[PDB]
Amino acid sequence: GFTPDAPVLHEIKNHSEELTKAEAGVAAFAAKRNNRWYPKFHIASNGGWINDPNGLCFYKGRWHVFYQLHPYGTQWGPMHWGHVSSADMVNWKREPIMFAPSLEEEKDGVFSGSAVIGDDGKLKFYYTGHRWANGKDNTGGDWQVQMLAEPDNDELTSATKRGMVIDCPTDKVNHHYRDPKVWKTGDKWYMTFGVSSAEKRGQMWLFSSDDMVKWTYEQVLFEHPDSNVFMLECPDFFPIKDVEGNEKWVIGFSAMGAKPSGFMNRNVNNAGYMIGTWTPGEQFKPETEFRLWDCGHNYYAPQSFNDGKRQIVYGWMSPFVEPIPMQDDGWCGNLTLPREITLGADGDLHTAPVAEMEGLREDTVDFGAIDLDVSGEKTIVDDAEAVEIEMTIDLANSTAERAGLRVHATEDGAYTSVAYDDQIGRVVVDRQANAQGDRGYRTAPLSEAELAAGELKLRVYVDRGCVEVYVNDGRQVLSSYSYASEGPRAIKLVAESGTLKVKSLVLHHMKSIGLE
Numbered sequence: 065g066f067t068p069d070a071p072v073l074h075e076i077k078n079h080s081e082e083l084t085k086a087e088a089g090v091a092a093f094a095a096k097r098n099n100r101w102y103p104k105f106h107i108a109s110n111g112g113w114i115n116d117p118n119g120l121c122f123y124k125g126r127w128h129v130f131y132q133l134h135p136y137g138t139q140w141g142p143m144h145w146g147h148v149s150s151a152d153m154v155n156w157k158r159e160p161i162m163f164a165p166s167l168e169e170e171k172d173g174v175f176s177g178s179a180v181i182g183d184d185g186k187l188k189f190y191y192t193g194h195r196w197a198n199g200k201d202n203t204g205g206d207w208q209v210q211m212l213a214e215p216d217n218d219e220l221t222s223a224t225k226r227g228m229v230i231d232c233p234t235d236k237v238n239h240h241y242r243d244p245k246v247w248k249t250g251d252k253w254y255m256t257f258g259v260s261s262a263e264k265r266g267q268m269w270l271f272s273s274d275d276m277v278k279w280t281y282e283q284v285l286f287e288h289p290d291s292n293v294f295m296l297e298c299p300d301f302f303p304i305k306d307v308e309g310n311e312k313w314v315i316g317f318s319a320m321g322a323k324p325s326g327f328m329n330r331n332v333n334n335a336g337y338m339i340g341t342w343t344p345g346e347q348f349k350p351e352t353e354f355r356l357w358d359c360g361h362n363y364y365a366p367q368s369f370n371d372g373k374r375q376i377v378y379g380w381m382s383p384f385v386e387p388i389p390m391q392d393d394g395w396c397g398n399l400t401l402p403r404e405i406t407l408g409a410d411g412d413l414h415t416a417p418v419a420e421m422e423g424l425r426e427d428t429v430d431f432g433a434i435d436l437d438v439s440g441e442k443t444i445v446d447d448a449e450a451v452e453i454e455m456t457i458d459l460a461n462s463t464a465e466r467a468g469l470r471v472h473a474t475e476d477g478a479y480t481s482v483a484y485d486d487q488i489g490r491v492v493v494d495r496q497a498n499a500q501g502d503r504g505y506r507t508a509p510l511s512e513a514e515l516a517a518g519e520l521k522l523r524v525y526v527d528r529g530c531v532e533v534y535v536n537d538g539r540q541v542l543s544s545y546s547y548a549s550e551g552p553r554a555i556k557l558v559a560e561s562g563t564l565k566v567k568s569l570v571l572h573h574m575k576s577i578g579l580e
């Protein structure tokens with residue numbers, strides 16, 4: 065039906081020529097870039113817009129990160145895959161752009177996808193080919209199919225497109241049909257991607273293969289129970305051992321259309337996961353409610369991959385809300401740090417940074433224990449461009465109603481706050497005092513156990529244009545853009561409306577990952 069016996073190749077452009085055009089676009093932007101917010105230790109394009117992480121793998125001794133790339137502007141546009149790699153996850157290098165639209169079935173965009181090591185030890189790429197359904201523009205909705213490509217070399221500098229391996233039964237779906245992941249379970253290969261059903265419900269479809277090339281429709285692996293959710297972008301699906309040592313499955317997706325409620329689903333679209341069980345032949349059986357990967361302002365389209373031992377996840381720091389002032393600066397968007405996924409005794413995922421992120425530290429400045437015996441502030445450093453702050457708050461002996469750090473604390477009185485808030489029992493990233501961007505605040509919940517524990521650990525990464533806040537060794541994370549003003553950028557320890565006892569505060573200067 066819609067699963068060809070062999071890959072369908074409809075070459076319409078010279079791939080090498082379209083790649084060369086794309087290199088010029090990103091290089092032109094890079095040369096005129098304003099570095100005020102450009103990351104020192106996060107992955108961005110050298111120029112232009114990025115979104116979703118793609119093709120994540122550890123392959124032939126190297127860490128690979130690809131990403132949705134618009135080479136020709138700082139807003140979303142004709143989609144390419146950019147590429148960076150590393151031997152150690154600390155020191156990165158720019159690779160040639162990997163994919164530009166060159167086949168009929170992808171002529172309006174090379175959309176998101178994944179990479180997986182086959183039975184022969186060779187990598188395969190699976191990605192979506194995008195067409196405008198009306199053949200013109202977005203007014204008529206999307207026309208999307210799944211594509212295969214194979215690397216030309218172990219370095220993944222280039223790939224040969226094989227063409228379309230799964231077509232779209234256009235009249236059985238609501239346009240959205242994208243973002244494949246391929247994995248092996250037992251003696252079968254499986255593929256999942258996101259679909260808007262004919263009834264406009266968000267679904268993940270499942271296909272199987274003996275050879276990773278010819279696919280068979282199996283069933284709908286999962287449908288989102290919220291009728292407001294019409295699409296599941298960037299689906300994820302992987303096994304992980306629970307505390308009992310039983311095998312669970314994590315389903316993840318970037319959900320479109322859920323309405324906000326209290327603190328929950330506040331971003332325009334929201335990415336999250338459920339933990340449950342899966343037997344091949346059956347649908348996913350959730351055992352949890354939907355939970356956000358990241359509770360911050362700017363996080364979407366996460367993808368995970370396995371390095372042989374660890375399941376590792378990157379998110380795109382998504383700016384969905386105007387104004388987006390970095391779009392004036394010749395780049396837009398970066399990825400988060402890579403996070404190791406663990407499943408704790410608390411029955412939830414933890415996403416601490418991978419151990420390699422300690423290699424970002426140039427130094428360790430130990431400020432020791434700090435007591436604010438009255439409401440007030442203490443400057444930790446007058447200027448911080450790119451730092452990691454580790455701090456332990458003594459909840460039991462602090463009366464402050466709100467306590468933590470002000471980062472990007474500039475001479476104009478602007479700052480971003482990272483605080484424990486005793487009135488809501490949450491960690492809060494508050495951008496109210498940002499001089500630019502859409503401001504607002506984001507909260508991460510603390511369990512009854514965490515609130516009763518009498519200490520709270522924060523690990524805060526401050527880059528030129530963003531913050532990443534790891535709570536209690538990655539039980540929760542908040543990633544937000546932070547639009548620092550001109551001049552020195554202080555870090556202050558602040559106690560509002562009472563006392564603060566900090567058991568430990570330690571600063572590390574962050575090195576460049578070599579991509580700027």
Ligand SMILES: OC[C@H]1O[C@](O)(CO)[C@@H](O)[C@@H]1O
Pocket residue numbers: 115116132143175176192242243297298318364365
């Ligand atoms: O750039 C297009 C890509 O971005 C997403 O919409 C999610 O951000 C994916 O579903 C799509 O493949």
